[PDB]
Structure formats: structure tokens, C-alpha cells
Design an enzyme around this catalytic site. Structure first.
Site, PDB file in Angstrom:
ATOM      1  N   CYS A  10      -3.529   2.593  -4.904  1.00 30.95           N
ATOM      2  CA  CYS A  10      -4.504   3.444  -4.225  1.00 30.95           C
ATOM      3  C   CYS A  10      -4.356   4.769  -4.940  1.00 30.95           C
ATOM      4  CB  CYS A  10      -4.161   3.612  -2.735  1.00 30.95           C
ATOM      5  SG  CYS A  10      -5.423   4.528  -1.805  1.00 30.95           S
ATOM      6  N   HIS A  28       0.824  -1.209   0.000  1.00 34.32           N
ATOM      7  CA  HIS A  28       0.000   0.000   0.000  1.00 34.32           C
ATOM      8  C   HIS A  28       0.866   1.272   0.000  1.00 34.32           C
ATOM      9  CE1 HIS A  28      -3.795   2.145   0.578  1.00 34.32           C
ATOM     10  NE2 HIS A  28      -3.103   2.963   1.351  1.00 34.32           N
ATOM     11  N   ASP A  78     -12.724   3.276  -2.169  1.00 34.80           N
ATOM     12  CA  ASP A  78     -12.240   3.440  -0.829  1.00 34.80           C
ATOM     13  C   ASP A  78     -12.999   4.511  -0.107  1.00 34.80           C
ATOM     14  OD1 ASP A  78      -9.263   4.061   0.990  1.00 34.80           O
ATOM     15  OD2 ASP A  78     -10.472   2.205   0.919  1.00 34.80           O
ATOM     16  N   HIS A  79     -12.319   5.105   0.863  1.00 32.84           N
ATOM     17  CA  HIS A  79     -12.881   6.162   1.661  1.00 32.84           C
ATOM     18  C   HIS A  79     -13.705   7.109   0.791  1.00 32.84           C
ATOM     19  CE1 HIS A  79     -11.029   4.808   5.237  1.00 32.84           C
ATOM     20  NE2 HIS A  79     -10.732   5.979   5.775  1.00 32.84           N
ATOM     21  N   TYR A 118     -15.589   5.321   6.563  1.00 29.45           N
ATOM     22  CA  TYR A 118     -15.897   3.980   7.045  1.00 29.45           C
ATOM     23  C   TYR A 118     -17.383   3.578   6.908  1.00 29.45           C
ATOM     24  CZ  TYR A 118     -11.098   4.062   8.666  1.00 29.45           C
ATOM     25  OH  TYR A 118      -9.715   4.090   8.552  1.00 29.45           O
ATOM     26  N   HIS A 144      -7.594   0.484  -5.163  1.00 28.27           N
ATOM     27  CA  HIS A 144      -8.573   1.222  -4.382  1.00 28.27           C
ATOM     28  C   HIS A 144      -8.808   2.460  -5.218  1.00 28.27           C
ATOM     29  CE1 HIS A 144      -6.718  -0.585  -0.432  1.00 28.27           C
ATOM     30  NE2 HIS A 144      -7.151  -1.506  -1.272  1.00 28.27           N
TER      31      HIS A 144
END
Lengths: 344, 344
Positions: free
Chosen positions: B236, B198, B308-309, B322, B263
Site C-alpha cells: 500500500c 497490509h 485505493d482511497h 469509499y 494498492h
């Protein structure tokens, strides 16, 4: 491309406006005064109210839908002249408030039909389903009772409309839509508004009740009644998509220049003449959406578009196709289609 | 293309699994035993449990993330040999349960950094923000306290680490990962598993602490350590995106053949070295998602991918990023880009 989203205003719509405006990409919403009944006149006061509550949350009022198409204008009664006048009046009111888009439908007695309005899927979500097999073995009034929920105070409500539209042939309806357009379209232009008619879902005759807009055939004919960009058509891929013989792509390319609105929803063929509504992405249903999105760019369409009914998901109390979840989720998928496709 | 979605299992994750499986298109999830701590050994029993709870809701376990990268292996201590052995052991366990994807990170003391973890946007949503200006005027321990919520215990805890990595440099750290990679990669090929390192976030140095996995230059150096498909790099786009110098698309075309996990996240610049997280769609950020998806197709990446986020929306209690909502809203958006992209 104005990314829209149907909203029932600050009433009945358990979906707060401060939440819809959090959908990524939304440019505005499409409302409708659920108070007024077929034939009523929309007062600048009410329209201004609606438009305001929308702009408060920094959302633009892209257009109003559910309009007042009184049975008189449709059946061809005599009172139609008074209603076509009360309709052109509100049309002046909508223009006065800046509204430029109006969605409407010329359906007979049933505004919508569905046999199972709580069909469970594998993923455990509820959906609206329409099975022709069930529509056959069921009485016309039962459908009325259904889409209007023993109600005897509404029994004559149906038995009257039946006796009214009785005799009104397909071509008769087209003519009644002619009279309507010839007197509402002219004022539309003055007020600078484009009307978009909603196709029939299902896109086929039910209960021997004749329906016009259900294929490229009528669609073409609708445009003929009055050759004017104001006399346009909203494109609910789903509604027309329900009939597998309806080539959605070509159509869009065939009459794309006259699409003023577009309901980009996917449907699933759970059987022959029977089908259901599902998630927006192609994998979920039977309609190749990418292909459909490609056809819209082709006609250079860049107007208002909104995802249509989806599914009742994530333990929501709302009836399938009326909640925020799947609709909002659908509104982002189509933008993903658009972006990429347009990226050519 | 396996559409994934990060899930914290039946624990702490207030997101029911029967809801995630209702996301249109999801093919599986990416879990992680939040119980175990850095260095522990994952027992087939626990792995089997997780995998099961996932397959129960008809979802596939695409891969496990948060892995045990003990500070010993990273700093280069002596106990690293025991931990690299307990790590290859769990690797055998994961392979025994069918797991084929493992995401991990070789970061020093801070697994993640953010100054404002409740930044409000115009749409009224909360987001995580990182401002380099704030990181400067703040003590290294304050960040620790922050990303771990004033305890005098935590102070020592951080003070210890600081001394543990005191003297370690980039290339110094590169060897520690080399060491580790030389004893974990062979086990991965045998167990039939791929790893994906990552990238840091922000992809630059903070508090003087060294950091390798930040830009393209190093990314290649990672693959260089051990030239093998198992030695991969979880792309990411959000982190790598924070530094506008990183040519996201170009590096995807360069080290793309070795990306084992992605991501698809978007970032919105808000100053010099200060950005925030936002909705996935390009219109709500600063990265061209359309273009990024493209580059992924050119390389032919059809592996596991997860949004992702995102943001804290619709008054969701969960901490921004989340939650269930804004993350799904994207999982259907990136699907649009893909369908639309591959559509030629």
C-alpha cells in the site's frame, strides 16, 4: 501540457463547473457560446462573461471551440466578405479578453455523421457508431434529419445547402479556405491567437460531398495555404484514427510543429469501414495510445489537450460522449501516459 | 497486470456492480463478506455466492480482502489455536472456490486511524486526514469511538482490548504473527493461495500500542518468519508513503519479489506527521506515482492491483475514499502509467 476539458458553459451543459474542477490535474476548460449562430460576432461582453464563469471555479479558459464558420465563406458565396470581416472582428474580441486558442472546422453540410448513436457494448455502455454500409443505403437528407434531433421546417434547410455547395469541388474548397485564412490568420497574429482546424470524422467522402482535411495529404496542404504558426491544426487522433491507412504516429511527427490543439480519444474498429467510439485506454479500442503519446512528446508538444467523446456510462442521461464520467476518467489515463512517457 | 477494484459486494456497497464493470480496463474486483466477524469461518456456499454475483457482471473475483484475524491469534491468547484452525478451514474453502489471493492485517486494536474524516480541499472535495498533533491530545478510547461510527458499551469494549494486549510488544507481536503464519502458510501452499500483509496507516505507533508492519526493516522480518511466496506483503504505497523516511521505490526493489497485492494510492503531506488522502495522480499528492509504477515494472510485478482511497468528489454521498468516482478516475490513471512505462 495544459490538461483541458470541453465545457458548454452555464447552459445546456448539465455538467456543473464545480465538478469538472474536481478532476485531478485539470488546468482549464475549452468553452463555446452555444447561443451565437454561424457568422455571428462574439461581443467582448459575452466572451468576458464566459471567461469569468470559468475563472470563478478557479479554472482557466484554455480556448474556445465551436466557432462561426458561415457557409458563405465555405461555399465561396459573395456574402463571405462580410462574414470573414465579422469573424476577424470577434477574433479581435477574443484577443482582447486574453483568449489565445480557437478551434474550427471547414466541413460542408454535415458537421458530424453517425449511423447508430446509441450502440450498446458488452460492458453495457452506449457509444456512437458509424457504419459506411448504412450511410450508402440512406439518403443525404436522412442524415441531416438525424444529426439535427418528421421535421419539414428543416427539410429546405438541407435542400438549400446542397444546392449551394453543389459544384464546389475539393480544390474549390481548399481555395475557399485559402481566402478565409488569408484574411483571418493575419489578424490572429496581431491578437496573438492560434487557430486549430478540426479534421473530418469520418475521414472520408460521404454523400459525394468533398472533404479536405482527412489525411496527412490535406493537412500538409492546409499548412501551405498560409505558412504561419497561427494557421495550425488540432489533432483528434480519433477522427483521423478512424481510417486505418492513416499512420497517426508518423503524422504527429511529420506535422507536430503545427498542432495547436489535440483531442486524445480512442476509437474501435467494429468492422471494415464501420467503427465506434470507446474508452480512452488502448485496450478498449484499436488505437495504440501509448505510441501516440510518445509521438506527441517527440514533437515537444506541450500545449492544451483534452480527451474527446468517450461513452455514455454509469446510467447517465447525457448522450454518449457528452457526459462527465468517461471523459473525466479519460483525462486521468492520458496524464498517466504522459507522466510515465515524460519520465524519460 | 490484473486491474482490480475493491467492492463490498451486494450489501452496503451503494456502488452497483454493473457500473464498476464499465470502468475501462478493469479485469476484476476484490471483495469481502462484510457479514462475517473476526474469527468466523467462510463457508463455500457464501464464497461461491460472492464469486458468482461477481462473475455475473463479467468480472473476475481477483481476491478477498478483509479477513478474520481474531484478536486471539494476535494477542496470543489460548483460543488462538481454535481460531487459527477456523482460519485454515476457510482458507480451504477459498481454494475450493478458485480464490487465490487473500489480503490481511495484523494490527492490534485500531484497524485504521484518522483525526479529521471530512477534510475539505481547495477543489472543494473531502478527504481523510491524520494529524499526529491531534492524536496526542486525544484519549485512546476517543479514537475507538471515532472509527466506530458515545456508548458506555464501546468503552468497556475498548477497555477490554486494551487489557487483552496489555503487555504485548513488537517482537511479542512478531511471534504471534509467526505462530499464525506457521499454521496458515502451509495450508496456503496446499490450497494454492498467496497472502499479503497490509502495512499500518499511519505506518507508525499510536497510543503506545505496538505495530510491526510499518517500515522496510520489519517488512523483511515478516517474510523472514516464513520464507515462502505465499507469505507475501500487500504493498500500500499510501500508508508506507505517509512516513517520508520510507524509500518506497527502493523497498519495492528489495521485497518486491514477495509482493502479492498492491494498492496504488497517493498521499499529500500537510505538516510534520500530518497528511491527507488525495487524487491518485502525482500532481495531486506528494509521492511520485510515475517513479513507483516504474519500480514495479523493474521487479516484474504483474499481479492484481487496485486504486485505493481517493476523495469525496462531485457531491457524492459516499464517505470519502469509499466512493466510485475518484477511485475509477485513478484506476485509469495507473493504467496510463503502466502502459506508458512498459512502452519501450
Amino acid at each position: 501540457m495544459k490538461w483541458g476539458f470541453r465545457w458548454y458553459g452555464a447552459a445546456g451543459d448539465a455538467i456543473p463547473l464545480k465538478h469538472i474542477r474536481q478532476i485531478p490535474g485539470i488546468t482549464g476548460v475549452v468553452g463555446t457560446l452555444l447561443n451565437k449562430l454561424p457568422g455571428d460576432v462574439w461581443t467582448v461582453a459575452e466572451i468576458q462573461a464566459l471567461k469569468q464563469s470559468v475563472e470563478q471555479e478557479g479554472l482557466a479558459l484554455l480556448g474556445i471551440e465551436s466557432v462561426a464558420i458561415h457557409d458563405a465563406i465555405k461555399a465561396g458565396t459573395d456574402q463571405r466578405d462580410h462574414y470573414i470581416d465579422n469573424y476577424r472582428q470577434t477574433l479581435r474580441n477574443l484577443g482582447k479578453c486574453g483568449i489565445s486558442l480557437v478551434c474550427y472546422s471547414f466541413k460542408p453540410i454535415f458537421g458530424w455523421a453517425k449511423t447508430d448513436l446509441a450502440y450498446e457494448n458488452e460492458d453495457g455502455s452506449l457509444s456512437l457508431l458509424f457504419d459506411q454500409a448504412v450511410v450508402e443505403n440512406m439518403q443525404p437528407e436522412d442524415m441531416y434529419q438525424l444529426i439535427h434531433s418528421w421535421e419539414e421546417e428543416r427539410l429546405q434547410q438541407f435542400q438549400e445547402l446542397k444546392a449551394m455547395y453543389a459544384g464546389v469541388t475539393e480544390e474549390d474548397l481548399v481555395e475557399n479556405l485559402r481566402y478565409f485564412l488569408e484574411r483571418v490568420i493575419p489578424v490572429c497574429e496581431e491578437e496573438n491567437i492560434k487557430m486549430g482546424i478540426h479534421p473530418d470524422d469520418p475521414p472520408w467522402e460521404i454523400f459525394g460531398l468533398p472533404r479536405i482535411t482527412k489525411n496527412l495529404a490535406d493537412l500538409k496542404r492546409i499548412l501551405s495555404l498560409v505558412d504561419s504558426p497561427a494557421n495550425g491544426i488540432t489533432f483528434c487522433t480519433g477522427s483521423l484514427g478512424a481510417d486505418p491507412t492513416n499512420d497517426l504516429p508518423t503524422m504527429i511527427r511529420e506535422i507536430g510543429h503545427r498542432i495547436n490543439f489535440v483531442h486524445f480519444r480512442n476509437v474501435k474498429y467494429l468492422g471494415e469501414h464501420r467503427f465506434e467510439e470507446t474508452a480512452h485506454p488502448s485496450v478498449a479500442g484499436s488505437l495504440d495510445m501509448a505510441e501516440l503519446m510518445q509521438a506527441l512528446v517527440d514533437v515537444g508538444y506541450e500545449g492544451v489537450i483534452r480527451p474527446d467523446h468517450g461513452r455514455a456510462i454509469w446510467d447517465e442521461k447525457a448522450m454518449p460522449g457528452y457526459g462527465l464520467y468517461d471523459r473525466a476518467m479519460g483525462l486521468t489515463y492520458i496524464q498517466g501516459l504522459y507522466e510515465a512517457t515524460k519520465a524519460k
